[PDB]
């Protein structure tokens, strides 16, 4: 009753439920990137589709069209700052050829593993889930945190986490209480 906030959707199920090629390809993306289910991939697919559709529209207008000149320039900034597109790729046609693995490459769970912080991509997810990593000195507890290129050098352990400037973690805390009580 008179509630006025949007709640949209971010994913779509595949049209053909049982494709051997699609099921095996999606299972490869799950283990290789450490995802809990296929909805993360389908979220990525919807994310990539939307940029593709608006790009498709922009390339039909002349390069001097103010809508093309403004929204084309904007979508380049969105691609470069989030690391999706290489900075020397300046044309609007390189957005079209964007791929699914490129988007998950910028996920924090991927970047944490690739920076040497996490030995495995599954270690990265739980480590992020356990408030152990801070981006620009801000705790992030979400594996799907797409990181900008300018914030890549600020990735570190959170100053509150046991691995760093914070107090000791749970195991070193509960067992210490056990020894003191046993006295």
């Amino acid at each position: 009753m008179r509630n006025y906030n949007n709640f949209n959707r971010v994913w779509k199920a595949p049209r053909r439920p049982f494709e051997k090629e699609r099921l095996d390809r999606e299972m490869k993306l799950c283990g290789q990137y450490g995802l809990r289910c296929k909805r993360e991939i389908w979220r990525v697919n919807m994310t990539l589709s939307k940029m593709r559709r608006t790009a498709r529209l922009l390339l039909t207008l002349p390069e001097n069209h103010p809508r093309r000149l403004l929204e084309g320039s904007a979508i380049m900034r969105r691609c470069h700052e989030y690391g999706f597109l290489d900075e020397e790729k300046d044309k609007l046609d390189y957005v079209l050829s964007l791929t699914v693995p490129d988007i998950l490459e910028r996920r924090l769970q991927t970047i944490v593993f690739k920076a040497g912080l996490a030995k495995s991509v599954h270690h990265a997810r739980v480590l992020i889930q356990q408030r152990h990593i801070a981006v620009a000195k801000q705790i992030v507890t979400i594996p799907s945190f797409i990181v900008r290129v300018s914030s890549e050098r600020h990735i570190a352990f959170a100053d509150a986490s046991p691995f760093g400037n914070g107090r000791t973690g749970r195991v070193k805390r509960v067992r210490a209480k056990a020894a003191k009580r046993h006295a």
Partner: protein
């Protein structure tokens, strides 16, 4: 009649979020139309931020602190529309309401003794009882004895303190005008030629300082000076020029980067 005004039905220039309030201050009748006015509660709370709530807004207004056209107003629903001098002596704000290039309301701060100088556009010329020529203006004021050369469409600069008109600016080509309606509203430009269609609306072709050729209905223009170079009163900070949106985007991105 109706007394409530819904949040969504409220004018967009008031900048009230659709999540905080279900209702909005319905502007009680007065000098300005409720579609073209900021209620004195909205002005004192959402624009000047002197009031935290609406309950703290009635505290200020009922005290008689807020002066409009050299007159204290106590009702929070007071229209307090365009080209009015608002003064709060406790803080000495002494600003007037104007329209910026994007068409929104602007609290243009005024200098000392500039508050006395105020303009208003003649909308109707008629005789009152006893053969008295009377001119009513966009503010709703009635001038009992105007200039013999004053016509409809001209603006008289009117002294609020003296309660007397001091000069007249006739609506002709080659004058400085500011648009008051539509998306074109808030742009200062020069009347190059006005096309007169009897019965229907009149079309005013304008040309601002930068050379942009734009038009609008003649009921939206407001003479503000004799020429584009010299204006009677101060205008919002953009100087009435709407620059390109792409260049609007580039400069603010550069300025934001210059901070870092």
């Amino acid at each position: 009649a109706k007394k409530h005004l819904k949040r969504l039905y409220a004018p967009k220039d008031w900048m009230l979020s659709k999540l905080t309030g279900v209702f909005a201050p319905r502007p009680r009748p007065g000098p300005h139309k409720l579609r073209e006015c900021l209620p004195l509660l909205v002005i004192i709370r959402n624009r000047l931020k002197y009031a935290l709530n609406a309950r703290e807004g009635e505290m200020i207004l009922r005290q008689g602190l807020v002066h409009v056209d050299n007159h204290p107003r106590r009702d929070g629903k007071y229209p307090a529309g365009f080209m009015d001098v608002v003064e709060i002596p406790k803080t000495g704000d002494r600003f007037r309401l104007m329209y910026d290039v994007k068409g929104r309301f602007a609290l243009v701060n005024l200098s000392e003794a500039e508050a006395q100088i105020k303009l208003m556009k003649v909308v109707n010329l008629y005789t009152a009882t006893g053969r008295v020529p009377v001119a009513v203006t966009h503010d709703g004021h009635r001038i009992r004895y105007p200039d013999p050369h004053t016509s409809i469409g001209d603006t008289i600069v009117y002294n609020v303190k003296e309660k007397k008109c001091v000069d007249l600016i006739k609506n002709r080509q080659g004058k400085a005008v500011i648009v008051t309606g539509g998306a074109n509203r808030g742009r200062i430009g020069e009347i190059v030629k006005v096309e007169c269609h009897p019965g229907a609306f009149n079309i005013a072709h304008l040309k601002d300082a930068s050379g942009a050729e734009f038009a609008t209905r003649a009921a939206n223009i407001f003479v503000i000076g004799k020429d584009l170079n010299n204006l009677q009163v101060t205008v919002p900070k953009q100087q009435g020029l709407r620059m390109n949106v792409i260049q609007e985007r580039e400069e603010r991105l550069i300025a934001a980067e210059a901070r870092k």
